[PDB]
Ligand binder design. Structure first.
Ligand code: NAG
Ligand code: NAG
Ligand code: NAG
Ligand code: NAG
Ligand code: NAG
Ligand code: NAG
Ligand code: NAG
Lengths: 293, 49, 245, 49
């Protein structure tokens, strides 16, 4: 049998990727209390760009390895974007207790996701200072995991009725967050986006980009065209498939032709040459010379 | 699939030559070729026998 | 009203290309010569909720594209997500959401949440016949369509796959969407036929180009069973053992 | 015809699962762990033999 010289993997041109870049580079990020939610589906996700960029220094991933994130397939990916101070960045972790964590964004202990935080002092800080960002400071009970509260009702800290007026014992729950360039790194604003990965009964719609290799023809090579795995010799084929049709089979039901995903050309697959070996020999007593068929 | 057809040792042309030899003997030698060396006989006399 | 399916409703089961071969396939197919409910819209207007069951074959004989789209949902209410397919001249919109030239489109008042959305080039005397097969298997909704220039015509056509969508929703009922045109509203004559797919075994004849040219339903009649057993459309004279009653 | 029928039957029998999860050896190996893979493969081997 002729063993396969090389292995070639062919997959369709990468397309339809969800706008991770847009959410990461969004000009304005929502306040932590009103954290935005992004739904990712029917897309191919490449995380190489996020890792490559210098600004995204923090890439802490819990429950899954970031390197194999592309390899692993997740039905739905959820992206939430909020800006928080450096001191409280630690609080956004599984099983971590903090003011931001308890009253703004809550992560369950069993959370499979990667949290991405990048310091963005220039964008979020002004010489005058930026008071647009707000954080919840007063809440009756700790927030449940992945729960968003936007209530502006005046907090009641006293027996006397609040009356809807923020008097003594009544304080507005949201507190303005102050950012300046001169402020220390801990006080300095950090943009944080956490990606949550989940698996559902419905077929996964989000998966990492599929790698491809150069086509090899007229040689015996292992082939993986669109998930069809076989060992064969690939040749140009006269036969023309219908547009929907991807691969072809003979009467025996063995695959005989495949259409390349990247280039729509039908290629015949022929099994690598194999045959029986027969030794033609005169009697051993007469001679030891042999001929092989 | 590992299933192979092995060619016959005697080719069709060779079989035809054997058949031709049998026909030639029967027409010219009658039944003698079967029982021994071919013996010439006229075909009408062979039919008479 | 009811009509005869004849040989219509055959679709390509898989993407595999087969040339000059006859293949037996077990799949959900419309039974040959099955009885199909017929709805006529002109004054007559028909828009009933019809159970999806395992699968549905929809054929519309229409002029001026009065037929517009289809709604598929378990309950057809905001409580449960419902697949929506609609068609306009520019494009066709496929949307999965919780749902409770003409410038008026009133398919849904509001959408609570949308799991999935899709857009594509439009799918669409009566000179046009539109054949659509709808199935939900393994969380994938499959649409197969053939358009032929023209009861249902007695001819054989194979429905090429149009799109496969990972809706991942449970569909038990479906309702057609029809367009009312104001000259209050006058509607041109429209015919839409609904049929239900059943598990069946079919022998499919493939030409050199790979198009299906003829089909046989094994269970339809005894001769068809004989053809299925022998895997040949032509049957020679004789007695053939086909099945055990 | 009889020879052709027998060869065709043998090749078609290759597709038969024989009670295994899959008829493709590679798919069985990837999907299942080695002990489970062995039992399913043994079913395929027995049927093909
Ligand atoms: C961000 O901008 C850089 C600019 O060089 C670009 O290379 C990258 O693809 C963009 N997106 C992300 C997610 O890094
Ligand atoms: C895929 O990309 C290549 C360029 O690398 C292009 O030549 C080819 O036409 C593309 N195929 C499809 C189906 O888009
Ligand atoms: C279809 O059903 C109707 C009753 O609803 C019946 O009268 C008719 O004969 C049926 N047609 C066929 C072809 O079975
Ligand atoms: C068709 O529908 C889409 C989605 O609602 C819309 O964007 C497009 O403009 C419509 N085309 C028309 C109304 O011609
Ligand atoms: C769908 O919308 C309802 C109403 O706003 C909301 O309560 C529910 O959580 C949504 N479902 C999903 C899966 O987002
Ligand atoms: C779909 O819902 C119906 C009830 O409306 C139920 O009987 C059926 O089992 C459901 N199917 C699936 C696949 O969940
Ligand atoms: C197949 O297509 C060829 C053209 O490529 C045509 O000559 C031939 O008649 C077609 N055969 C059938 C059965 O459609």
């Amino acid at each position: 049998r002729v063993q396969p010289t090389e292995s070639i993997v062919r997959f369709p041109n990468i397309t339809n990727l969800c706008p991770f870049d847009e959410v990461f580079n969004a000009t304005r990020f929502a306040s932590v209390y009103a954290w935005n939610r992004k739904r990712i589906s029917n897309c191919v996700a490449d995380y190489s760009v996020l890792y490559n960029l210098a600004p995204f220094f923090t890439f802490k991933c819990y429950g899954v390895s970031p390197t194999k994130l592309n390899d692993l397939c997740f039905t739905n990916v959820y992206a939430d974007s909020f800006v928080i101070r450096g001191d409280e960045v630690r609080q956004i972790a599984p099983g971590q207790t903090g003011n931001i964590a308890d009253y703004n964004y809550k992560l369950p202990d069993d959370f499979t996701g990667c949290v991405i935080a990048w310091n963005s002092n220039k964008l979020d800080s002004k010489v005058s200072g930026n008071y647009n960002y707000l954080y919840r400071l007063f809440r009756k009970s700790n927030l449940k995991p992945f729960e968003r509260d936007i209530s502006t009702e005046i907090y009641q800290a006293g027996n006397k009725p609040c009356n809807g007026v923020a008097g003594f014992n009544c304080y507005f729950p949201l507190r303005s967050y102050s950012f300046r360039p001169t402020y220390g790194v801990g006080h300095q604003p950090y943009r944080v986006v956490v990606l949550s990965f989940e698996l559902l009964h419905a077929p996964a719609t989000v998966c990492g980009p599929k790698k491809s290799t150069n086509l090899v023809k007229n040689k015996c090579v292992n082939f993986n065209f669109n998930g069809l795995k076989g060992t064969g010799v690939l040749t140009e084929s006269n036969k023309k498939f219908l547009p929907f049709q991807q691969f072809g089979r003979d009467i025996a039901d063995t695959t005989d032709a495949v259409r390349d995903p990247q280039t729509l050309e039908i290629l015949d697959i022929t099994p690598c040459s194999f045959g029986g070996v027969s030794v033609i020999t005169p009697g051993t007593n007469t001679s030891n010379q042999v001929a092989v068929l | 699939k590992g299933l192979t057809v092995l060619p016959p040792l005697l080719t069709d042309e060779m079989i035809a030559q054997y058949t031709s030899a049998l026909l030639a003997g029967t027409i010219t030698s009658g039944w003698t070729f079967g029982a021994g060396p071919a013996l010439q006989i006229p075909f009408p006399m062979q039919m008479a026998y | 009203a009811y009509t005869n399916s004849f040989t219509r409703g055959v679709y390509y089961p898989d993407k595999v290309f087969r040339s000059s071969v006859l293949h037996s396939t077990q799949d959900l197919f419309l039974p040959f010569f099955s009885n199909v409910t017929w709805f006529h819209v002109i004054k007559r207007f028909d828009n009933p909720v019809l159970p999806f069951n395992d699968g549905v074959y929809f054929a519309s004989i229409e002029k001026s594209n009065i037929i517009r789209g289809w709604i598929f949902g378990t309950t057809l209410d905001s409580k449960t997500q419902s697949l929506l397919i609609v068609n306009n001249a520019t494009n066709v919109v496929i949307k999965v959401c919780e749902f409770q030239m003409e410038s008026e489109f009133r398919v849904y008042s509001s959408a609570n949440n949308c799991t999935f959305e899709y857009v594509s080039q439009p799918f669409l005397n009566f000179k046009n016949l539109r054949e659509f097969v709808f199935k939900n298997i393994d969380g994938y909704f499959k649409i197969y369509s053939k358009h032929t220039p023209i009861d249902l015509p007695q001819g054989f056509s194979a429905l090429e796959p149009l799109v496969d969508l990972p809706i991942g929703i449970n569909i038990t009922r479906f309702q057609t969407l029809l367009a009312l045109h104001r000259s209050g509203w006058t509607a041109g004559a429209a015919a839409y036929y609904v049929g239900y797919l059943q598990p069946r075994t079919f022998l499919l004849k493939y030409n050199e180009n790979g198009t299906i040219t003829d089909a046989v339903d094994c269970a339809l009649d005894p001769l068809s069973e004989t053809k299925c057993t022998l895997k040949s459309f032509t049957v020679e004279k004789g007695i053939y053992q086909t099945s055990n009653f | 015809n009889h020879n052709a029928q027998a060869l065709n039957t043998l090749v078609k029998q290759l597709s038969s699962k024989f009670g295994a999860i899959s008829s493709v050896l590679n798919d069985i190996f990837s999907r299942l762990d080695p002990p489970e893979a062995e039992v399913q493969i043994d079913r395929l081997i027995t049927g093909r033999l």
